Amino acid sequence: SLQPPPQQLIVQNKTIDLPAVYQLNGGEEANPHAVKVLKELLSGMLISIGEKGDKSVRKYSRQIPDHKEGYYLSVNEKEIVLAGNDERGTYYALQTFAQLLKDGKLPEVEIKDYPSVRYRGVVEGFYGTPWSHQARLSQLKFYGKNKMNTYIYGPKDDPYHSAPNWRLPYPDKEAAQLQELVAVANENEVDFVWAIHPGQDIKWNKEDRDLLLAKFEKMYQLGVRSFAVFFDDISGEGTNPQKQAELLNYIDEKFAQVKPDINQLVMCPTEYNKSWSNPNGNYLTTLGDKLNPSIQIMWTGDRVISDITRDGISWINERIKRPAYIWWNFPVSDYVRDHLLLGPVYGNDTTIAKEMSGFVTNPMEHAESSKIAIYSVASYAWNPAKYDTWQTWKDAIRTILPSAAEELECFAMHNSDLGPNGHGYRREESMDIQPAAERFLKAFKEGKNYDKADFETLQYTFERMKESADILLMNTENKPLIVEITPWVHQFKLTAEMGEEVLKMVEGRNESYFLRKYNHVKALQQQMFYIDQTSNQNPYQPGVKTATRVIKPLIDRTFATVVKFFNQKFNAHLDATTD
Numbered sequence: 001s002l003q004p005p006p007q008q009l010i011v012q013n014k015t016i017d018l019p020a021v022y023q024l025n026g027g028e029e030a031n032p033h034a035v036k037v038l039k040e041l042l043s044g045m046l047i048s049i050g051e052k053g054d055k056s057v058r059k060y061s062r063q064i065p066d067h068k069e070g071y072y073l074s075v076n077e078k079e080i081v082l083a084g085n086d087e088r089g090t091y092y093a094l095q096t097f098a099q100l101l102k103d104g105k106l107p108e109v110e111i112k113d114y115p116s117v118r119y120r121g122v123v124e125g126f127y128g129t130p131w132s133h134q135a136r137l138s139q140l141k142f143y144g145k146n147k148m149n150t151y152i153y154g155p156k157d158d159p160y161h162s163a164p165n166w167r168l169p170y171p172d173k174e175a176a177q178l179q180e181l182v183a184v185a186n187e188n189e190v191d192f193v194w195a196i197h198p199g200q201d202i203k204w205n206k207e208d209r210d211l212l213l214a215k216f217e218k219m220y221q222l223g224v225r226s227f228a229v230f231f232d233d234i235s236g237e238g239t240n241p242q243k244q245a246e247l248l249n250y251i252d253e254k255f256a257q258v259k260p261d262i263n264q265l266v267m268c269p270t271e272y273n274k275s276w277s278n279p280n281g282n283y284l285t286t287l288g289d290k291l292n293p294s295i296q297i298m299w300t301g302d303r304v305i306s307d308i309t310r311d312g313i314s315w316i317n318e319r320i321k322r323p324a325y326i327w328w329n330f331p332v333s334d335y336v337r338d339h340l341l342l343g344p345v346y347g348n349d350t351t352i353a354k355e356m357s358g359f360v361t362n363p364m365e366h367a368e369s370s371k372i373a374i375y376s377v378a379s380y381a382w383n384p385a386k387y388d389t390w391q392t393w394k395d396a397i398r399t400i401l402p403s404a405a406e407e408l409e410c411f412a413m414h415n416s417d418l419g420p421n422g423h424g425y426r427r428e429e430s431m432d433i434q435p436a437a438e439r440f441l442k443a444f445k446e447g448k449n450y451d452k453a454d455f456e457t458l459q460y461t462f463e464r465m466k467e468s469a470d471i472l473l474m475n476t477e478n479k480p481l482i483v484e485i486t487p488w489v490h491q492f493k494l495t496a497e498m499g500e501e502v503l504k505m506v507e508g509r510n511e512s513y514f515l516r517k518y519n520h521v522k523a524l525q526q527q528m529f530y531i532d533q534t535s536n537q538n539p540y541q542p543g544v545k546t547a548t549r550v551i552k553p554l555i556d557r558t559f560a561t562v563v564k565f566f567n568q569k570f571n572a573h574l575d576a577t578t579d
């Protein structure tokens with residue numbers, strides 16, 4: 001089950017063993033990063049590793065795809081061939097090789113691969129608590145594993161990339177940590193893109209221009225080889241696309257064209273989605289016209305939160321006269337901070353790879369939890385035409401938490417919707433039991449017998465959520481993930497219990513039992529409010545919501561309805577509300 005799926009793949013249905021004795025050909029010649037991975041997989045048979053042009057992979061150079069980051073991989077009993085179009089490609093061959101190895105044994109196959117989107121990875125662009133240094137080292141290694149080549153770096157607690165301290169050099173301590181990120185991004189074939197955010201206090205004069213240049217040069221000396229300049233945050237003169245183009249072209253010419261090894265050079269426009277673009281203005285096409293063709297322009301789609309469509313990307317491509325570099329604002333939850341967004345990644349058109357220069361995801365402030373979407377994005381961006389939302393979602397989860405994948409699946413299935421929000425952006429959730437939920441409720445609401453099978457499905461779900469919750473909380477394979485999701489897990493358990501007791505009210509043996517359940521529900525609704533007042537307290541959407549699209553309303557509505565039915569029956573007046 002390769003992730004991302006290779007462009008071309010032929011499997012033989014024979015299978016050889018990792019050879020106990022082998023002979024490495026190209027050890028000296030291939031990308032050291034890939035070879036290091038090979039040595040670690042290899043802790044006799046001919047294994048050939050190298051890039052196009054290496055003496056070691058001469059025999060196979062017609063098999064190597066002619067694409068940046070492409071590779072040829074081969075496995076049969078005679079030899080193993082791992083051969084890149086360039087260094088990054090060989091490393092990518094090795095990342096695929098590692099997924100093939102299962103029990104010192106390899107399948108016999110032949111693969112020709114390359115990415116369909118040129119740039120792919122993550123932009124650290126969410127409001128909230130910034131990630132720790134450690135979380136970032138871990139992200140970078142996860143990117144290399146999934147062949148993401150882009151990391152746009154922006155922690156919001158580092159003031160040396162924005163007003164006013166962008167002007168200033170990183171202090172020693174922070175510098176060295178930053179170097180460490182760059183070192184790790186290099187080893188894993190990721191472009192560390194340092195992004196500067198000047199728009200707040202930038203002057204259109206030559207001195208500020210020079211200070212930026214020198215800042216870029218300092219980052220260069222610390223190892224950075226890719227750069228972004230942000231203009232989303234600016235006003236007045238600064239909003240002139242003409243002048244933005246001049247400054248960026250200026251940096252291209254005096255800097256990027258002058259160093260030998262500058263990879264990405266990227267800007268974020270002042271109008272970065274169609275809806276905040278002024279059709280009575282000039283901004284985009286002027287930028288398109290005046291900005292050097294090798295400079296990327298970032299774009300989030302039709303609206304701030306938006307999936308990428310064919311209409312959507314034509315519309316921006318026509319204007320900037322190049323393929324947009326997509327900034328996808330999902331799974332970022334910084335405007336729905338009381339939700340986790342753990343669902344699958346979908347909605348982006350799968351036939352538009354030629355039309356986009358980059359694809360990056362803006363993740364949640366929950367770094368590990370974000371790995372589900374991130375792995376899915378890497379898959380989508382590498383081979384959109386073979387993109388399989390749901391298999392890739394299950395694959396991500398099995399990858400992040402193999403020892404409790406079914407449990408994270410159950411939990412994630414019911415934590416994907418945003419609930420109503422200022423952006424009007426929603427996701428599906430709980431689709432598996434939706435039909436049973438809706439039938440049971442329609443029948444139940446109208447005094448009409450519900451179906452036993454729907455009742456049992458709901459029962460079953462609640463039981464399974466409790467099991468999953470409890471396994472999740474005690475799991476120690478990925479502690480960071482568990483630390484991140486714990487409050488919500490507790491909340492998810494409470495939801496399940498609440499569901500169980502309400503269902504017991506529906507089954508309703510006798511009046512006294514019914515009041516026990518009723519009081520137990522009130523008490524549980526009560527601990528949910530507790531958690532929601534004491535956990536995840538942030539200024540904007542403080543708290544913890546879970547299972548909110550289908551499940552909590554099914555339970556609330558079933559509760560109101562059953563109490564109503566109880567009040568008629570016994571001329572009682574129990575409060576029927578869930579709030």
Ligand SMILES: CN(N=O)C(=O)N[C@@H]1[C@@H](O)[C@H](O)[C@@H](CO)O[C@H]1O
Nearest residue numbers: 125126127232268272304332334335
């Ligand atoms: C491209 N871009 N800023 O340049 C953004 O997407 N910025 C913020 C982005 O940082 C934020 O996560 C979302 C949702 O809160 O709102 C956007 O406006």
Ligand SMILES: [Ca+2]
Nearest residue numbers: 029030051054
């Ligand atoms: Ca070489």
